[PDB]
Design a protein around this nucleic acid. Structure first.
Ligand SMILES: [Mg+2]
Ligand SMILES: [Mg+2]
Ligand SMILES: [Mg+2]
Ligand SMILES: [Mg+2]
Ligand SMILES: [Mg+2]
Ligand SMILES: [Mg+2]
Ligand SMILES: [Mg+2]
Ligand SMILES: [Mg+2]
Ligand SMILES: [Mg+2]
Ligand SMILES: [Mg+2]
Ligand SMILES: [Mg+2]
Ligand SMILES: [Mg+2]
Ligand SMILES: [Mg+2]
Ligand SMILES: [Mg+2]
Ligand SMILES: [Mg+2]
Ligand SMILES: [Mg+2]
Ligand SMILES: [Mg+2]
Ligand SMILES: [Mg+2]
Ligand SMILES: [Mg+2]
Ligand SMILES: [Mg+2]
Ligand SMILES: [Mg+2]
Ligand SMILES: [Mg+2]
Ligand SMILES: [Mg+2]
Ligand SMILES: [Mg+2]
Ligand SMILES: [Mg+2]
Ligand SMILES: [Mg+2]
Ligand SMILES: [Mg+2]
Ligand SMILES: [Mg+2]
Ligand SMILES: [Mg+2]
Ligand SMILES: [Zn+2]
Ligand SMILES: [Zn+2]
Lengths: 26, 78, 107, 53, 96, 71
RNA sequence: GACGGAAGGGCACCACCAGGAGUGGAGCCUGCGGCUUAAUUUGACUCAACACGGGGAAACUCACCAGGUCCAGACACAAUAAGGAUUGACAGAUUGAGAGCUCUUUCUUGAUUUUGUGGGUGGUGGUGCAUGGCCGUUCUUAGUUGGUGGAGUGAUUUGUCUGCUUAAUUGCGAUAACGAACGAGACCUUAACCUACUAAAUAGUGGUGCUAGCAUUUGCUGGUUAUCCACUUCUUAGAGGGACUAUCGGUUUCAAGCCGAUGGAAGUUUGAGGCAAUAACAGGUCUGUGAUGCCCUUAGACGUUCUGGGCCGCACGCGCGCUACACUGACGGAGCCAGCGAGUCUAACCUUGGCCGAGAGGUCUUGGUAAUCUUGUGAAACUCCGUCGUGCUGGGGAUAGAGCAUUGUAAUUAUUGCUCUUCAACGAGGAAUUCCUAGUAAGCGCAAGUCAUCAGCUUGCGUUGAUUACGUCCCUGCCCUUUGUACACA
């Protein structure tokens, strides 16, 4: 009842493609 | 661990008092009436004595789940 | 195939001499009921925790003082037993308000 | 981040309060029970300090 | 109160999974037990959460106890954008 | 009590001057962008933060204080 | 009912008698007034304010004063605003300050804040004469009430009383009352008695080993946290027992009771407490409380924090104390004996022992979460042998100079300790006034509370241990009837 267990929902929705990273010139 | 007996038994007494307060405040519309705490191997027990326990429980166990978590997070029980 | 001796030491400490003594004596007849070897419950001098305080929250009035006490009774019973009884005897004979302590090792 | 907001509370009446009401005045410190005398009397029974003599 | 949303999330998140927060009444603690923020950020965040409903408060011996409510459940559901029927302190764990 | 002693000249807060933000990104010739206000070399400042130009001074504002770069 | 500056009875070392030991005088300690001050925070003023608010304040405490910061001003709306609502800061100036407080200069931050109104929020701000709760006082007191009956139209009264007795409305007795309940008693706790019960290397004895010293004649005096055996008198604490003013005798309505004698651990409620009815107070406490009404204040804050000062300030008045005036003594050697206690985990409490140091202390280690180690707490008065010899003396130890140490971030207005020096008043205290009846008074230290450091205070504790009553109402205080009242907010 009222499943998906938020404590582990960030662990099931832990798939990538939610960031970006690039820097460091001069 | 590693306490004195005098310090231990007094420490438990205070423990009772702080516990009995927090329920006395949090379970007033439930006719809270006092507690006892049973210290066993692997478990510490707490028996709420109220006249309206069906409201202490909460929908299939919501409210006591909060009260435990409350008592838990404060006195640093695992 | 098990069960050697361990030379146990069960200390009982509490402020409820009726429940303390009940757990204290029931142990002594749950051990010679089944033929161990032991030194009977040893009563340590009951210590008395005094607290002396004025009754008044404020300062007015004759200086009425008032002293509370909290008495601590601490027993110990030494048992020579195997692992089978001591673990049977630690789960049972629990009592809310009688702190059982079980130590081993004559060293 | 504010290096301008505190001063040693390591000892004396400023370091300790009453675990019930937070007063520093007239703390009973015996047995680590750390309760002011006015709170102790309204809790002494539940702590296990009773009146025999 | 003034604080970066960064610390707001740690509170708002942790309140959702655990459903209940505790906090000693002593600002200047500089680090909550179990949370990654200053103690002060906790108490005044929950106070803000409490004053628009969403959570009750109990004090009793210098420790706040905060009880996430039903009407609160949907709010931080929005603020954490998690979907309807995600979770709370509302799980009967396994068989206990 | 003894209200209102107060010899004069009350104190003011900070203002945080308006300063309609940087066009300090000079492009040269449509659209070679020459990027005025040299940036900062601390890995907590991902080179998007620049250095303030006072006298004897290149200051990293993103470091609330840290790391005076001297040029 | 309450009250009287009427009458009659009681009761008590917060009353006297009989005395003890004192206070009142002195030096200092400590509180209250006063004055002083930037401020010297404040409550309380007969018993029932004045070493009381556990109130021994260097910061903290903290309320006061001279100054500097911060918002930790929830939430609703509104305005502002992504072309930036707002946040922060290097160095400088500034500042007590290495506070970006403010300012110069100019990066930074991204809707968290800002401004405003409404609403709230904290406050050791006011109000104890708005309250809760608690406490103190009357009260070292003995009073409160219903059932059945009796008296009165009624409110009520009788019961609940002249006397006697008791610590007690405790009873005896008398009796239109009879028979009960609350409160007193009972009860509970502690200190006393067990060679009877159950045992104990965390308590201790006798035996034996193993072992030392002296005498030798077999003895005497010790060592040995297990080399063994046994015991529970001593210590411990469970269960019981024990006393009921017993037996006998004087006295007495020969009633409750009282007094003496024997026995007894114990016969003053066995001693000392804990608990304690109905009621009253404008008693104290909003400065213990995140107990609280209302009022005040709420960003140049009465919020809060930080820096420094103050609560200790000194012509003086009052109160609790400490130490004294010496020969029942100081001093120096030597003897050398208690009890109630406490004591360190996510930490630096209680400290043995060995060194170093005159001392205070230091340093190296160690036992203890404790009947196990500190500790036999080898405490102090005290007891013993000497020195001094009545002289402000070697009694007395104020004031003060100089040095060394500990506690703490900090010791200056000197926290404390030690050393040398300085060597005051005080030659027993006017009028006054306090406390007390047996292991009590007084003398004497100790542990605990507070406590980083500081007890001349307090709560308890044991040690040494009397004199004089064992009565009364004269003084003072309070109860009780009677009686008067036009009081009943009494
Ligand atoms: Mg005893
Ligand atoms: Mg006399
Ligand atoms: Mg005299
Ligand atoms: Mg007043
Ligand atoms: Mg200050
Ligand atoms: Mg600040
Ligand atoms: Mg506003
Ligand atoms: Mg307003
Ligand atoms: Mg208040
Ligand atoms: Mg009053
Ligand atoms: Mg009152
Ligand atoms: Mg008397
Ligand atoms: Mg009639
Ligand atoms: Mg009468
Ligand atoms: Mg015996
Ligand atoms: Mg005799
Ligand atoms: Mg008044
Ligand atoms: Mg109060
Ligand atoms: Mg003072
Ligand atoms: Mg002398
Ligand atoms: Mg001598
Ligand atoms: Mg030297
Ligand atoms: Mg150790
Ligand atoms: Mg002289
Ligand atoms: Mg004299
Ligand atoms: Mg002390
Ligand atoms: Mg004092
Ligand atoms: Mg008499
Ligand atoms: Mg009349
Ligand atoms: Zn308190
Ligand atoms: Zn930088």
């Amino acid at each position: 009842a009222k499943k998906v267990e938020l404590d582990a929902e960030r662990i099931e929705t832990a798939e990538k493609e939610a960031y970006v990273p690039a820097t460091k010139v001069k | 661990a590693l306490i004195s007996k005098k310090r231990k038994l007094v420490a438990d007494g205070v423990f009772y008092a702080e516990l009995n307060e927090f329920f006395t405040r949090e379970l007033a519309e439930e006719g809270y009436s006092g507690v006892e705490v049973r210290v066993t191997p692997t478990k510490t027990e707490v028996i709420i004595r109220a006249t309206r326990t069906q409201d202490v429980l909460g929908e299939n166990g919501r409210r006591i789940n909060e009260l435990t978590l409350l008592v838990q997070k404060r006195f640093k029980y695992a | 195939q098990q069960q050697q001796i361990i030379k146990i030491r069960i200390t009982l400490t509490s402020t409820k001499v009726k429940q303390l003594e009940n757990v204290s004596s029931n142990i002594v007849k749950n051990a010679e009921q089944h033929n161990l070897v032991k030194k009977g419950p040893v009563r340590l001098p009951t210590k008395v925790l005094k607290i002396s305080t004025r009754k008044t929250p404020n300062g007015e009035g004759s200086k009425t003082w008032e002293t509370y006490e909290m008495r601590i009774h601490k027993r110990y019973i030494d048992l020579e037993a195997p692992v089978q009884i001591v673990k049977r005897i630690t789960q049972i004979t629990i009592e809310p308000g009688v702190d059982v302590e079980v130590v081993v090792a004559s060293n | 981040e504010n290096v301008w907001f505190s001063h040693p509370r390591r000892y004396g009446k400023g370091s300790r309060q009453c675990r019930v009401c937070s007063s520093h005045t007239g703390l009973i410190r015996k047995y680590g029970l750390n309760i002011c005398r006015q709170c102790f009397r309204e809790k002494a029974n539940d702590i296990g300090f009773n009146k025999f003599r | 109160m003034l604080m970066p949303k960064e610390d707001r999330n740690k509170i708002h998140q942790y309140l959702f999974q655990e459903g209940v927060v505790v906090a000693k009444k002593d600002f200047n603690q500089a680090k909550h037990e179990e949370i990654d923020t200053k103690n002060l950020y906790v108490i005044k965040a929950l106070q803000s959460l409490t004053s628009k409903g969403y959570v009750k408060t109990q004090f009793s011996w210098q420790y706040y106890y905060y009880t996430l409510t039903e009407e609160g459940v949907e709010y931080l559901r929005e603020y954490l954008n998690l979907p309807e029927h995600i979770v709370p302190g509302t799980y009967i764990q396994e068989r206990n | 009590k003894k209200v209102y002693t107060t010899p004069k000249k009350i104190k003011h807060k900070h203002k945080k001057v308006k300063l309609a933000v940087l066009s300090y990104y000079k492009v040269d010739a449509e659209g070679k962008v020459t990027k005025l206000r040299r940036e900062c070399s601390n890995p907590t400042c991902g080179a998007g933060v620049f250095l303030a130009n006072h006298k004897d001074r290149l200051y990293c504002g993103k470091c609330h204080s840290v790391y005076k770069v001297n040029a």
